[PDB]
Amino acid sequence: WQARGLGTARLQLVEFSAFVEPPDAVDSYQRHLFVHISQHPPLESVDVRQIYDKFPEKKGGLRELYDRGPPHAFFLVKFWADLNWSGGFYGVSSQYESLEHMTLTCSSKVCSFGKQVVEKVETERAQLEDGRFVYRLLRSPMCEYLVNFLHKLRQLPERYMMNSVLENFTILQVVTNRDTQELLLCTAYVFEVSTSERGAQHHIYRLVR
Ligand SMILES: CCOC(=O)/C=C/c1c[nH]c2ccc(OCc3ccccc3)cc12
């Protein structure tokens, strides 16, 4: 019963993106996508151990979460960030669907060298749509650490330097049932940069053991 997308039977990712809109968007709109998954054969597995030291350790790190299970809820998403896009609006949008009606809690731990640097925790109540429940965390403003990290990481003079920094930069995303405390989706994000004739791109893996 192996997964084909980033999701389980209980909770599926529908869309995610991190983006920026220039000031001139209020005239002629446009947004620039740093990264962007869109899910409108089984994925390739990656042993979770090979990424242990890239994430937190005591309580809420990769291993201690994988030991609570469910193992099938764990995914690795490798990003190629488009970093070729100044005083504009930086944002993140997430969307999930479910068959059952829950109140999600959604944690975004940003880690530098595996140290938890910045965390955001949100909750979202289900809204019933076409026979199914829908969870919408659209346009959350990026935390100022991420915005600043990006202007710095944009001004670096070489891509290989960019990917060197980014090798110590990861994000853990943990969605759990707020009521029952059980885990529904855990997604480790590792990052590189994209030779921006190509925009963003991504690979989704099942974390296994
Ligand atoms: C909404 C409040 O918290 C935040 O600000 C962000 C939370 C995130 C949760 N999962 C993510 C996946 C990627 C990402 O940024 C992409 C990105 C990173 C590095 C270089 C280039 C691009 C942000 C998040």
Residue 128's CATH number: 2.70.50.80
Q: Tokens in use for 166?
A: 């980014």
Phi, psi of 151 (to 5 degrees): -70, -35
Resolution (A): 2.6
CB atoms within 10 A of CB 110: 20
CB 76 within 8 A of CB 51: yes
State which of 54, 82, 146, 156 you would mutate to test the pocket of ligand 1, scoring each by most atoms of that ligand within 8 A of its C-beta: 146
Residue with tokens 């004739």: 197
Q: Which domain holds residue 20?
A: 5-209
Protein residue closest via CA to atom 4 of ligand 1: 142
Cα torsion for 123, 128, 131, 134, to the nearest 10°? -30
CA separation for the pair 206, 71 (Å, rounded): 9
Strand order in 32-38's β-sheet? 32-38, 12-21, 89-98, 133-141, 127-128
Ligand 1 center to 18 CA (angstroms): 6
Percentages helix, strand, coil for the chain (3-state, rounded to 5) are 20, 50, 30
Ligand 1: residues within 6 Å at CB? Answer: 18, 34-35, 81, 92, 108, 120, 140, 142-143, 146, 171, 173, 189, 191
CA separation for the pair 6, 169 (Å, rounded): 21
Ligand 1 center to 16 CA (angstroms): 10
Which residues does 114 contact at the CB level (< 8 Å), separation at least 6? Answer: 53, 54, 55, 56, 57, 168, 170
CA separation for the pair 28, 129 (Å, rounded): 32
Half-sphere exposure of 56 (CA within 13 A, CB side): 19
Number of domains in the chain: 1
Q: Tokens in use for 133?
A: 């429940």
